[PDB]
Design a binder for this molecule. Structure first.
Ligand code: CA
Ligand code: CA
Ligand code: CA
Ligand code: CA
Ligand code: CA
Ligand code: CA
Ligand code: CA
Ligand code: CA
Ligand code: CA
Ligand code: CA
Ligand code: CA
Length: 318
């Protein structure tokens, strides 16, 4: 079911590709198009091969050459596109912790929507690159239940999908109801333990049951019961439980629907997901927002920045 929008180019020729990129830079100006048409048509693993082959042919660093020939939001995308898949999430996480004021949005998005396999892969890569323990770093930069929930999630420990138990589903649905709507204040720990540790397949069933017994969708209750930090995280986790593609589709929409563009988010989501579920993301986006992902990117962005994004994205006809 899970489909990306960028795949390996067949008949890929690492050296030819380098020569092309060289031809697009060496001399007066810069052939943005040629760089943009090639790199959005090669997978992450293949860009790495292009970057290594470029060095052997020209004794120059591809990425740095492009940094010195490109500009603005376009350069940012290309640079993000060039970052090894393995290191990308950890890179965005590191920059989100760096400096006194943390970037919660990024922590929540990534940690709430990455599968256990992925999260433990991120943790190892992050410790390899930076010599810091990710969990420890997150603990240092967050606080309260938001910190607690993140720590729980970072254990990469969630129950595995298993035989579905009707008794457990009713029990857990009731616990959430008793912990939220029925209680003066909120049993934050119950929400956290349940929404943090229970399996995906199990929780989807618990949601349907929660609605049946409470009249509320769990998302309404989370909004009615919590605020800021914690609300966003629990909302993020819940939506990811339902559908990571649908969660990330909503993430893109909200990055574009206002007066500006949250370009930092536009870029991260498109790039990181281009080889996993961006096709799924596009389907869900259309499904929930009346237009294609394409048309909204077209409306919010300009120039080569726009051109690359659209080629990366695809689906003009969604
Ligand atoms: Ca040039
Ligand atoms: Ca030019
Ligand atoms: Ca530049
Ligand atoms: Ca960043
Ligand atoms: Ca910080
Ligand atoms: Ca902050
Ligand atoms: Ca309450
Ligand atoms: Ca509360
Ligand atoms: Ca409480
Ligand atoms: Ca609220
Ligand atoms: Ca906008």
């Amino acid at each position: 079911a899970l489909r990306g929008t960028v795949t390996d180019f067949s008949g890929f020729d690492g050296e030819a590709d380098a020569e092309v990129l060289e031809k697009a830079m060496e001399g007066l100006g810069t052939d943005e198009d040629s760089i943009l048409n090639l790199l959005t048509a090669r997978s992450n693993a293949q860009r790495q091969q292009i970057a290594e082959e470029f060095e052997t042919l020209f004794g120059r660093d591809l990425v740095n050459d492009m940094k010195s020939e490109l500009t603005g939001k376009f350069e940012k995308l290309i640079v993000a596109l060039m970052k090894p898949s393995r290191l990308y999430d950890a890179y965005e996480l590191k920059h989100a912790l760096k400096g006194a004021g943390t970037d919660e949005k990024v922590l929540t998005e990534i940690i709430a929507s990455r599968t256990p396999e992925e999260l433990r892969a991120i943790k190892q890569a992050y410790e390899e690159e930076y010599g810091s323990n990710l969990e420890d770093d997150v603990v240092g930069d967050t606080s309260g239940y938001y910190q607690r929930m993140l720590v729980v999630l970072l254990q990469a420990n969630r129950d595995p999908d298993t035989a579905i138990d009707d008794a457990q589903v009713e029990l857990d649905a009731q616990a959430l109801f008793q912990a939220g709507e029925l209680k003066w204040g909120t049993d934050e720990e119950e929400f956290i333990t349940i929404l943090g540790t229970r399996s995906v397949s199990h929780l989807r069933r618990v949601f349907d049951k929660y609605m049946t017994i409470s009249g509320f969708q769990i998302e309404e209750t989370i909004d009615r019961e919590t605020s800021g930090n914690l609300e966003n995280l629990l909302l993020a986790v819940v939506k990811s439980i339902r559908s990571i593609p649908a969660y990330l589709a909503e993430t893109l929409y909200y990055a574009m629907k206002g007066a500006g563009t949250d370009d930092h988010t536009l870029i991260r989501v498109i790039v990181s997901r281009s080889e996993i579920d961006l096709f799924n993301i596009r389907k869900e986006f259309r499904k929930n927002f009346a237009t294609s992902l394409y048309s909204m990117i077209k409306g919010d962005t300009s120039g080569d920045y726009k051109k690359a994004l659209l080629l990366l994205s695809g689906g003009e006809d969604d």
